[PDB]
Write a protein that binds this ligand. Sequence first.
Ligand code: NAG
Lengths: 49, 49
Amino acid sequence: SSGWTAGAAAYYVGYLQPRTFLLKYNENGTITDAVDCALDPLSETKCTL
Amino acid sequence: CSNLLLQYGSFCTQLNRALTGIAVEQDKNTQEVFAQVKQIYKTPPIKDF
Ligand SMILES: *[C@@H]1O[C@H](CO)[C@@H](O)[C@H](O)[C@H]1NC(C)=O
């Protein structure tokens, strides 16, 4: 309960929410870029257009 | 209903593009009618015509 040293690692937890995204599939079939629609007005315009 | 409508984004983009074209056309019409000359002349103070 005392004789143990901690590790040296880190983690991060998010929280998914229902959101609409734009995704770009490259020539090889992989996703390379995306836009979070409803983040800021500029992304909203990218998403509408 | 919006999630169901997401598959008609092509149609809605087309509609918005058409209406935007109409609006820009109206501005163009007004400019080409009235802004024939870009020198804003002012009438002389005295009226001797
Ligand atoms: C796609 O795959 C080929 C072979 O793996 C590679 O040469 C090419 O660089 C890849 N496309 C891009 C944009 O990297």
